[PDB]
Amino acid sequence: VLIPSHAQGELTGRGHKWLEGDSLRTHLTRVEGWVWKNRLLALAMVTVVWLTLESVVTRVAVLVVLLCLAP
Amino acid sequence: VLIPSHAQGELTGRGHKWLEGDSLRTHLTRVEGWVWKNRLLALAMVTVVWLTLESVVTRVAVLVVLLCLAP
Amino acid sequence: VLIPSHAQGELTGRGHKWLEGDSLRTHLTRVEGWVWKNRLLALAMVTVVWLTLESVVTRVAVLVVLLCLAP
Amino acid sequence: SRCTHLENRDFVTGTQGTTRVTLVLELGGCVTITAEGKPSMDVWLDAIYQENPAQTREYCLHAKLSDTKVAARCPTMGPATLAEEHQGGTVCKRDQSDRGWGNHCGLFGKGSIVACVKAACEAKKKATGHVYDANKIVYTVKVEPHTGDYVAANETHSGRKTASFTVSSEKTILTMGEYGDVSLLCRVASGVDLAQTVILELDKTVEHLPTAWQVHRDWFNDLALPWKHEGARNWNNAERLVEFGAPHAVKMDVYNLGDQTGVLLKALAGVPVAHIEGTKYHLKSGHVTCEVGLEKLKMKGLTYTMCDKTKFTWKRAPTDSGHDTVVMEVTFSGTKPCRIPVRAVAHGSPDVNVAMLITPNPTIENNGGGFIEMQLPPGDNIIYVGELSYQWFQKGSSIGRVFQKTKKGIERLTVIGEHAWDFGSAGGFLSSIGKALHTVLGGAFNSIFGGVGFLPKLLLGVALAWLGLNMRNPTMSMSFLLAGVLVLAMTL
Amino acid sequence: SRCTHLENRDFVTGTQGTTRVTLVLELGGCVTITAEGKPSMDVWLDAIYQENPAQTREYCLHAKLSDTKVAARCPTMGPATLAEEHQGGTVCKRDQSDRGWGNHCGLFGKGSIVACVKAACEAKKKATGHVYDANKIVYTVKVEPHTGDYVAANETHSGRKTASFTVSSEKTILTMGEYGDVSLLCRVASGVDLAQTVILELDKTVEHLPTAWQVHRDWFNDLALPWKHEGARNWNNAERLVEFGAPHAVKMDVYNLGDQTGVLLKALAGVPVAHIEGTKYHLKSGHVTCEVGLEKLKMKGLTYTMCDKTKFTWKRAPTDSGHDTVVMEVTFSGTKPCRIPVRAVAHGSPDVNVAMLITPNPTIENNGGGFIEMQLPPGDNIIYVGELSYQWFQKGSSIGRVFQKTKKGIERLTVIGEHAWDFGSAGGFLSSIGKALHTVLGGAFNSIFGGVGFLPKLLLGVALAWLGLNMRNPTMSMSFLLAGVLVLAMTL
Amino acid sequence: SRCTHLENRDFVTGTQGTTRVTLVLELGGCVTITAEGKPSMDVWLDAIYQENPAQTREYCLHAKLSDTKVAARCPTMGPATLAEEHQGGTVCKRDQSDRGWGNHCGLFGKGSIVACVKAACEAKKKATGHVYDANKIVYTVKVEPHTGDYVAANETHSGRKTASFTVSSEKTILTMGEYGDVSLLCRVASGVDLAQTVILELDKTVEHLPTAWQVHRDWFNDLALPWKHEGARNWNNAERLVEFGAPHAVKMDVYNLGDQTGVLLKALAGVPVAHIEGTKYHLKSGHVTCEVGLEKLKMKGLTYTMCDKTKFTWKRAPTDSGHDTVVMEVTFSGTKPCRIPVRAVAHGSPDVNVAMLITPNPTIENNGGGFIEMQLPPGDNIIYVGELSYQWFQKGSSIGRVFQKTKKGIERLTVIGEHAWDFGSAGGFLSSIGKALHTVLGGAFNSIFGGVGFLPKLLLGVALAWLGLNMRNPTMSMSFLLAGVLVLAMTL
Ligand SMILES: *[C@@H]1O[C@H](CO)[C@@H](O)[C@H](O)[C@H]1NC(C)=O
Ligand SMILES: *[C@@H]1O[C@H](CO)[C@@H](O)[C@H](O)[C@H]1NC(C)=O
Ligand SMILES: *[C@@H]1O[C@H](CO)[C@@H](O)[C@H](O)[C@H]1NC(C)=O
């Protein structure tokens, strides 16, 4: 059923391809898609930063991952 | 020569006006205009935050004002 | 809509220009414009000087800025 | 009903005993008066105008320059003069040039030079102001009864009566067909603050512009353009559109600053427009606190029989009204006139009519009737018109409609509502205290802070808030209360 | 001499051995080259133009609107479309109105509405830009020798030779009559930075305006007006002059923003003007670093006799020159040609000639000659022309003239002088180091701070100065040096 | 009995006095109403449809491209334009290429290039949406009495009555032959949430696909494909199927993205299907809370005699029903009509009838009767029909059937059961509190977490659980309760 994407291989190239920027930036529009639809949850993850962990180096390690985990 | 703006008066209104949002947001596109043209200076004002003052309540009082001072 | 002013560029000049003094002094007639219309507020900012801060070097840093912030 | 047409609408109740109602007829609104035993009325403010008012300062937005005359003298040879250095509507500027032997002078240094142009004005480029004489202003209140018919905006309703209100009117008794009479007492004095309102007018014959505007007095009298009055041949401060270049020792160039219409139109960011119709100068934003007497009203058709319960159909199905009410239109086919058996039960098999009607005693007439407006409680409801039942789910909530009116009531309290606590009637320790606790505060922060704008109000309040953080005396630490006012009160 | 006409003038010396002089021919100036044994020359930049250059983005300052077409739909009846939502030069805006039964819709809520107008442009209201192709630009340098005649500005001098300088010119040998030849090597590449210069043009047929302007590239490409190119039928971003009111559910009003000429002319505060002459697009501000060879020059009339010491008179008496020099014109009546015995003693009956001449070897010709320019020391002086003595009091001071040139030299160091250390010739550890110590600093604070203006430079410098007052590290307390730069360097 | 055909089945009891029963007729279910003294009825929801509803946004899944036209310009020669940059249904993209001397340009750098194609749509590749108008939706409830006959699915039962339920219906009295009458009050408003339901339709003439679907509103209005409405000639966002390659300085290639049907069909993983029959757009998943009145019912054949105890045989032997009940069919040969002496004793020689019947008063008629359904207690049972005894071992347990209904009751509490606490009747502190304790919680975690999916619900709940492990305040350690909700509640 499911065909996996071929951003795994990425052999070579100086000719022509399909989507140079959209191989990376569709993953940067899903994440921006999560924010504008869930503003109540985008502010809910601010409670992680200044209240729970207080571990600045590893605060960002929770923020970036949990947004990327939501597909 | 100069005609001053009439966001000063602001009597009433339930009929029709010109620009409800653009009375405020033209002042919010000048400031966004300052940033995208002066990216090297936008990062230069980060040196105020974590290096010079270290006075979190009054760090923002320098940042917001000096951006609004540039017309 | 908005055309920004070209006191930003200021290339050169030994021929003729428009307004050598009024590039600077229209910003000095706005400020004089704020005073004569708001005499009750011009005296209200005297309460900053001798009552609240009492920090002569930085008294003027509030006075000059807050007048220039009002466009 | 005109109140069903537009968005803004307010309902006013009245019990047995409530016969004098004090409204605030704001322009571009509609008020539905409901009273127990009385036919419900729709009263709104229609128009505010004055035929041919007095006109203050004009302006010139595009200077018409002609007859450039320049004279110059050698540096020790009697500084230059002209005949046009005194005549009306002539801009002149003296300057010192650099006379050489190229332009035939015995010595060098700084020779005098002066230029003069005739500063006329371009046709149809005048910013003509206008002000309202309180003795000749004409308010206009129209009252429409809920007849049970429906009339669209293209059409004109029959029973819609119109009452003008100058300063020389105290009370108007309106013959409302068969529903009785209504009395309207309009405080024409306490309407729009006419002292601080100037009707700005450009070329009204231009197609794609508003015909007029409505600006504050202090803004209009402090422009920096050329100005005159009616009948004046020549301008004042005519140099404000004319700039002179530095001379090249024989000629000093004269530069116009072109049209100024674009700068003026950008300066009116957030100004309510005003319409000009022929000679009448209307407004599109204003209010007046008229008082409505209800003692001379009566319902129409209480002596009529009930209709047949079978013979109802629909010209138009029931639907939501956008004001948490329900509107519909039935069609009757039997003998006319008769009263329409309208009821609605929620859900208990209760036989309990919970349809709080807006149009009271709905009656089919010999040539009209059928439009029925009601307000239902939230939840599942079954609307009955005789033997004609319809399911309905009222989309509101229990606290939803109470939270609706407070969202209205706060936005009622704009600068209109700064004046208007009087939307009720004789509150005493409720509403008459509201006038006291607000006029001494609102009037105080209108004398100061009046003509400063959104951004300084959002700045100076924060500045006085920041002084609350760093303050010596705990007694003087109550300047934090201004953050409770300046950041909140005059920011809506 | 053309250098005697205008105010701005610079003298350049040259010793025995100095034969190659590197000038900076700035426009609206005049340079007098003086060399020992050589006839003195006046070299200036005359004009900078290009016949019919390529034109970039046009603009529209006054939108011409026509054919308002509005369509609307009931709130669940297929959101509104029009044929003019695709056609060229048409501004459209979609909005949600409030459809009632007044405008005949089955339901309530938010009905779609959209209006479209044909956004043409008014005639002669276009802000046409123009740019300079470096391959087709024409500099123009004129050289006039000090012939001893005098020619006013209305008249044209005989020996004034003119040399054009395109990109395709290396060196031009000019036949200067009998004074010899002069060679001019103009760096046409390193003149005005043509990459960042746009000639703005409005309606040039308007009387009381400059014909053109000279704006920065980054300013001109970041306007917020409608724009197109040459030959394009329809505009882009045409909605920037058209604003739409909130609709009243059937019609949405379309409002023009009028002319925008006034906003544009106020935006050019401190912009150097530019002239258009027919097809040629001149400039009135610029510079070029041409190099002058002096090896093929010789004085004229060393073989002539001396004049009779008695037969001199005056066409024009001696007078001040405004450049701390003295100018005059004698008239000879004997046999011509001959050399004029010019000398001037200060005060000792010393017979010591202190008249540092500017016109070397003054000679009366068969049809002209007599104009003599000299520089005298401060104090009482007696000028001799044969047997013709005149008292003179030189109005300057000892340190006054040295303090004069430094006041010149600082104002030489404008943005022209930011480029121009090369007004001398091969300084090595004087001038070639000046290029090094300034380009890496001036170029650094042009990349940043380039396009910020006077007021932020006078503010952000003080802000970085104030951080010097409150700084932790004494090593990092050298941010006070920016107050020594930002308050001083880019504030002139 | 239709309830014997399908898997899902619910039994509803009723005592002497229980006459109003509130059901939740979920589609693809069957409810057997049992009441003491009343004949048992089978009431189910049959179909939910609307003839020719209004259709919202269409889509295009396969772009039909034609007329590729490309124009390009040399890098300072007026950026490229085309006539098809404005026409409807045309995708265009501007780009900067690299013009050389190979393609004949005077300069190098970045030359403009633009291509335009006509973006039509392929036939029968449209994802046509449809929505349900609540005023025209038609629920359909069928009621079948337990007649004692049996009718298979291929056949149609005689006494099966059908009652439609639009918005314009209150109550329907159904003539159930000789069993009496039944009243059905269907809350048509509170059925399927029609505001958030869109019937998606592809090419319905395709053989091996469902004819339609049923998607959420927020999902359907946020697709990223080209779309239009009914009657619209040209598409919107037509570039979402067309991608352009980087040009080789003269031609820019235009690439279609082919059919998109496969991507759409994979996106509907776990979407309930919907059937289209001619013009009617059915559903295959939904519910409605109809209320059943039982006061106008009576048993049939109480006046009849008892049958002969000898003359019973079998058309079909007793067997399990898959609902912990027992079904069978006898055949009588004596005089008709008569009542069938049905009883069943467990094990005691007890003469105690423990056969809780489902079909009450089983009677052989003159042309039918014999189908008998009963529920027996767990263990060894002997079923008697006169003198016709059969062993039976009821396979359930004592607590097994109670644990069966709670396994039903939890899976009753799906999103249907989130609405449905009302399967009983007037619980007060049992069921009416159930509506209160669930709507404020279920509605809260539908506003947030609504449209996030199984995997983040199984992740974000564990994340908030993990914050419970490392929490400062014991008062704020009650965020572990969300692990009791988010891992459990919205994971079934
Ligand atoms: C009523 O409105 C409709 C809108 O289509 C219009 O056609 C008609 O002319 C209007 N009636 C009158 C009397 O203006
Ligand atoms: C140039 O010479 C003419 C000849 O008489 C004289 O009239 C004129 O004044 C001169 N031009 C100027 C600008 O002075
Ligand atoms: C009932 O189903 C059987 C299956 O064999 C079939 O023979 C019969 O035709 C069906 N009855 C009807 C009325 O279709």
Numbering used by the authors:
A (entry chain F), B (entry chain D), C (entry chain E): 2 to 72
D (entry chain B), E (entry chain A), F (entry chain C): 1 to 492
Q: Any passages from the paper?
A:
Here, we report the structures of the native TBEV virion and its complex with the Fab fragments of the neutralizing antibody 19/1786. In contrast to the principles suggested by Caspar and Klug and unlike most isometric viruses, the three E-protein subunits within one icosahedral asymmetric unit form unique interactions with the surrounding glycoproteins. Two M-proteins and two E-proteins form a heterotetramer in which each M-protein interacts with both E-proteins.
Nevertheless, the structure of the mature TBEV particle was determined to a resolution of 3.9 Å. The quality of the map was sufficient to enable the building of the protein components of the TBEV envelope, which contains three E-proteins and three M-proteins in each icosahedral asymmetric unit. The cryo-EM reconstruction contains densities corresponding to N-acetyl-D-glucosamine in all three E-protein subunits of the asymmetric unit. The N-terminal loop of the M-protein interacts with domain II of the E-protein and presumably prevents the reorganization of E-protein dimers into fusogenic trimers. TBEV homologs His7 and His216 are located 5.9 Å away from each other, and are therefore likely to have the same function in sensing low pH. Repulsion between these amino acids is likely to trigger the release of ectodomains of E-proteins from the virus envelope, enabling the formation of fusion trimers.
